[PDB]
Amino acid sequence: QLVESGGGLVQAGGSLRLSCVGTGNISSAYTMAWYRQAAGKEREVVAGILNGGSTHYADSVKGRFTISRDNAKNTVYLQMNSLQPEDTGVYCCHVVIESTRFVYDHYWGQGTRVTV
Amino acid sequence: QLVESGGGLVQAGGSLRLSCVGTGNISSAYTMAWYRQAAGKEREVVAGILNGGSTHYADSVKGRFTISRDNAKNTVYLQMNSLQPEDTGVYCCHVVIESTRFVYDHYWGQGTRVTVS
Amino acid sequence: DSWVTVFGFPQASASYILLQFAQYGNILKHVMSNTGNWMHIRYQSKLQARKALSKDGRIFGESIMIGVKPCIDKSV
Amino acid sequence: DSWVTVFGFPQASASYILLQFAQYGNILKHVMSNTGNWMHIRYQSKLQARKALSKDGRIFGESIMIGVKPCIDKSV
Structure with a gap:
């Protein structure tokens, strides 16, 4: 099981790191990804570790957001920077x-x- | 323009070479292929020179048929061997x-x- | 009816195409071909599967036109 | 209505896929994409186009599942 945290209210302009920790080992993950859905909008992939360890980012978050992992902690992270009101929504992690x-x-x- | 020749009547077991000649230069062809259609049957590719000069053959003619070309003569060939009545149909060349x-x-x-008895 | 076949992508893009299809529902499971240019995706609902099916013929990643059809691999 | 888009194949397999589609009608012309996994084929007739479209979702060369849809590229 995956449990995300780190959400809440930031002001437009600010930084925020989301966390997702696995109950079992996720070190052999094929892929890891973060998705967001703003109210009355389609879900969109925001950041992905593709198989082999390349990354994909939504065009809107390129250069502002980073997806990383700690194997030792069994955790996935989304680093967000220069947050805009359009970054507002429910974020979820996918392994x-x-x-x-x-x-x-x-x-x-x-x-x-996340509410900016 | 492409004009095929060399067809007709052959006996089961015989060999036959079809020819197709172009009126303009076909030496830079992307692909060359022979197709056949037997009466009340779907046309099928028999033999193709793919881009880069690799070949594809219908499973039914593998080892029996060869597609080749002569750049100098502007001609494509289909060498047929061990002909069977099932090889009967209209053959056409494709460049x-x-x-x-x-x-x-x-x-x-x-x-x-091409007609095999 | 929760299952679809997504096809037409090279092996190098498989995981890129999966994240794109993961947008349309919480995928339970996916099965990748050995050789083929296809994968079978199990969504939670018909409704999610239907959103995936509506993407048949659409271009992903600037240069990959993608096919999506109802899954007919019984076996799976 | 004579034009279809065939898609889902790798660049190396393009000419193998064109010979497969040449079976269904005497193709007048085809236009290949720079990067894309697709091509626009012009047949002689609607009926020929319809026979290529019926091949949507079928497997060619043991491992290439193929998409076929009505051509929408207006320039072509």
Whole structure:
């Protein structure tokens, strides 16, 4: 299971680090990603560690946001900078793990509210 | 323009070479291929020279048929061997030529009838 | 009916295309082909699957046109 | 209505996929994308176009699942 934290109220302009910790080991993750959904809007991927360790960012957060992980702590992070009101929404973390060859299980957190 | 020849009647077990000649230069072709259609049956690709000069063959003709070309004569060939009644149909040759970048013109011959008893 | 087949991408892009499809629902599971240019995605609902199906023929990552159809791999 | 977009194949397989689609009608012309995994094929007729469209979601060359849709690229 995945439990996100670090959300809340920041002012426009500020920085904020989201956390997601796994109950089991997530060190062999195929992918790790953060998604956000603002009220009455479609969910969008904001940041992804792709398989092999390359990254993808939404165009709107390029250069402002970083996705990282601590293997030792079993945690995924989203570093957010220069926060804008448009960054407002429920953020959730996504971890994919290969069980048997070619079969991948998906793990989702409950989400954490960010309000700029 | 492409005009095929060398078709006709052959006995089960025999060999046959089809020819197709172009009126303009086809030496820069993107691809060259032979197709066949038997009466009340879907046309199928028999043999193709893919871009870069690799080949594709229908499973039914692998090891029996060869597609080749003579640049000097502006001709494409289909060498057929161990002909079976199932190889019966109209054969046509297909040449593709890049005009401008990413744009390709397609040339088809009239066909040539091959009949195996 | 929660399951779809997403196809048409190179092996190098598979994980990029999965994050794109993860947008439309909390994917439970996905199964990747050995050779093929396809994967089978299990969403939570028909409604999520339907949002994935509506993306059939759309371009992702500037240069990857993507097919999406109902999953017919019984086996899966 | 004579034009279709065929998609979902790697660049190395383009010419293999064109010969597969040449089966369904005497193609007049095809336009290949610079980066994209797609091509626009012009057939002689609607009926030929319709036969290529029926191949949407089928597997070619054992491992290439192929998308086919009505061509919408107006310049082409």
